[PDB]
Structures are given as C-alpha cells and as structure tokens.
Amino acid sequence: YSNPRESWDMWHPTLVAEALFAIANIFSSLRLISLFTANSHLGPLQISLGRMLLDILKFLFIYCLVLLAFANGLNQLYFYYEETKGLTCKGIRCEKQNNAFSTLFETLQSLFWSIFGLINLYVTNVKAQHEFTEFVGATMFGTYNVISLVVLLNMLIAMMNNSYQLIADHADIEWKFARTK
Amino acid sequence: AHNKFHDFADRKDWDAFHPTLVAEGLFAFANVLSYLRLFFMYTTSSILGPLQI
Ligand SMILES: Cn1c(=O)n(CCCO)c(=O)c2c1nc(Oc1cccc(OC(F)(F)F)c1)n2Cc1ccc(Cl)cc1
C-alpha cells in the first residue's frame, strides 16, 4: 500500500503504526518514575505510591463490577431508542452528545466519563416524548453518579488514608531496599 | 400487554405510561439489581473479601 489524508481507512497500517507509536511513547516517558528511587527526598514517596497502587487496583475491581451493572442496566433501558437521523457525529465524543446509552460499549464509555463530569445531562432524555423511561433512565444515571462519586470515591480516599498511614513507617526500609536493587 | 395491546405502530407513537415501557423500565431496574448481586460472591475470595465487608 505504498491521496488525501481524509480518504484513508480507519484500519490503515500507517494509522495503526501512528497510534502504537503514541502509546509506546506514553509508556516510554513514564520510565523516569523508575529513575526516582535513587533520590533521597522523594524516593520513599514514589515507593509508597508503588505500595498503594495494588490497593488501588483492589478497589478498582469493585468499581468495575458497579460500572458493568449500571452500564448494562442503562443499555437494556435505552437501546430500543437507537436513532441515526443522518447526523454528522454519533456517540458521546461529538459537539452535541447523542446515542450515549445506545450500545454496551458506548454505555460503558458514557458512564466512565460521567465520573469526570464530561457527559452533560441532556443524554438522559429521548428525542421522543416517553417521559417515564426518561425519568427512570435519569434516576439510574443519578444513582450510579451518587455511588461512584460519593460512596466509592470517598471510600477510596479513606482506604488510601489508612493504607498510607500503615506504610509510612515501613517506607524508609522499602526505599532503601529498592535503591539497593 | 401481549394479551391486550397489539396495535402495529412506531415506538414514538405510544403513550408515555404504556405497560410495555413500564415493563422494560422495571426489567432494567431488575437487571441492575441482578448484576449488583455479584458483590456477595466476593466474600469467598481471599483478596476482595475484607474490602467489600
Ligand atoms: C437517586 N436520585 C436520582 O437519581 N435523582 C435523579 C432523578 C432524575 O433526575 C435524584 O434527583 C435524586 C436521587 N436521590 C435524591 O435524593 C437523594 C437521596 C439520597 C442521596 C442523595 O445524594 C447523595 F448521596 F446525598 F449525594 C440524594 N435525589 C434528589 C431528589 C429528587 C426528587 C425528590 Cl422527590 C427527592 C429527592
């Protein structure tokens, strides 16, 4: 395969090479964190973050269960209302959000981004006038937001607090062991 | 709804409080609860148990 750039297919080998180089670059530029065990002022800090990253993953499993539950519930609600209408863009990543809870992939993406507030509130109403389904979808969306933005995040903060309180005493010997390695 | 309402029309033509819409809404609520039931399976694990407890 050796033409304007917009005519390229979405799975062109050069575009895949571009994206894989980008991900390899964000993985290569994070290796300087491993270079920070030698420094005395912040080596224990980096070591402590490395300790409680495992507990972070421990809690992210529970988050993944909650995310799957609410995502497939919202998909089972809204996917009967799939529409195209010849729109310029579909999905959450448009100027105007549409078909957010359309498929399971789009629902998982839309519920993930709702933690950071980048999904507006006009995704819960349908273009039709079925008010009851709109209300129960907005209720499910608000319930998941309440969970993953009040319950689970603050549980994560308190659990991180106790974990760093526990590993603050053993941070020095851990940093010395990592620096000797 | 299967016994009573079988009028061939588009989905947007229906009433807001039709039994089919209520049935799918309660089905979605039941699905959220069914998928959230899996938290009580985590207690048998030696890793995810104490955190959920
Ligand atoms: C779950 N839930 C929800 O989904 N929606 C969106 C529905 C469609 O918009 C809501 O508006 C909504 C809601 N719970 C609500 O009261 C809370 C109860 C418990 C916790 C909470 O929050 C937090 F934990 F304290 F932070 C909020 N309210 C507000 C409300 C609205 C109407 C009436 Cl009569 C009474 C209360």
UniProtKB/Swiss-Prot annotation, chain A:
The chain crosses the membrane at residues 16-38, 52-74, 140-160. Residues 39-51 are cytoplasmic. It comes from the Eukaryota. Phosphorylation modulates TRPC channel function by regulating the level of TRPC4 at the cell surface and by increasing the association with NHERF1. Strongly expressed in placenta. Expressed at lower levels in heart, pancreas, kidney and brain. Expressed in endothelial cells. Isoform alpha was found to be the predominant isoform. Isoform beta was not found in pancreas and brain. Disulfide bonds join 89-94. Residues 1-15, 75-139 are extracellular. It is found in: Cell membrane. The protein 4.1-binding domain (654-685) is required for binding to EPB41L2 and channel activation. The calmodulin- and inositol 1,4,5-trisphosphate receptor-binding (CIRB) domain (695-724) is sufficient for the interaction with SESTD1. Forms a receptor-activated non-selective calcium permeant cation channel. Acts as a cell-cell contact-dependent endothelial calcium entry channel. Forms a homomeric ion channel or a heteromeric ion channel with TRPC1; the heteromeric ion channel has reduced calcium permeability compared to the homomeric channel. Also permeable to monovalent ions including sodium, lithium and cesium ions. The interaction with spectrin is important in controlling the translocation of TRPC4 channels to the plasma membrane following EGF stimulation. Homotetramer. Heterotetramer with TRPC1 and/or TRPC5. Forms a heteromeric ion channel with TRPC1, with a 1:3 TRPC1:TRPC4 stoichiometry. Interacts with TRPC4AP. Isoform alpha but not isoform beta interacts with ITPR1, ITPR2 and ITPR3. Interacts with (via PDZ-binding domain) with NHERF1. Interacts with MX1 and RNF24. Interacts (via CIRB domain) with SESTD1 (via spectrin 1 repeat). Interacts with CDH5 and CTNNB1. Interacts with SPTAN1 (via C-terminal spectrin repeats) and SPTBN5 (via C-terminus). Interacts (via protein 4.1-binding domain) with EPB41L2. Interacts with PLSCR1. This is Short transient receptor potential channel 4. The lineage of its organism: Eukaryota, Metazoa, Chordata, Craniata, Vertebrata. The gene is TRPC4. The chain holds residues 459 to 641 of 977 of the full protein.
Swiss-Prot record, chain B:
This is Short transient receptor potential channel 1. Seems to be ubiquitous. Belongs to the transient receptor (TC 1.A.4) family. STrpC subfamily. TRPC1 sub-subfamily. Heterotetramer with TRPC4 and/or TRPC5. Forms a heteromeric ion channel with TRPC4, with a 1:3 TRPC1:TRPC4 stoichiometry. Unlike other TRP channel proteins, does not form a homomeric channel. Interacts with TRPC4AP. Interacts with ITPR3. Interacts with MX1 and RNF24. Interacts with FKBP4. Interacts with PLSCR1. Interacts with PKD2L2. Forms a heterotetramer with PKD2 with a 2:2 stoichiometry; has distinct channel properties separate from PKD2 or TRPC1 homomers alone. Activation of PRKCA induces phosphorylation of TRPC1 and subsequent Ca2+ entry into cells. It comes from the Eukaryota. It is found in: Cell membrane. The chain crosses the membrane at residues 22-42. Forms a receptor-activated non-selective calcium permeant cation channel. Forms a heteromeric ion channel with TRPC4 or TRPC5 that has reduced calcium permeability compared to the homomeric TRPC4 or TRPC5 channel. Also permeable to monovalent ions including sodium, lithium and cesium ions. Residues 1-21 are extracellular. It comes from Homo sapiens (Human).
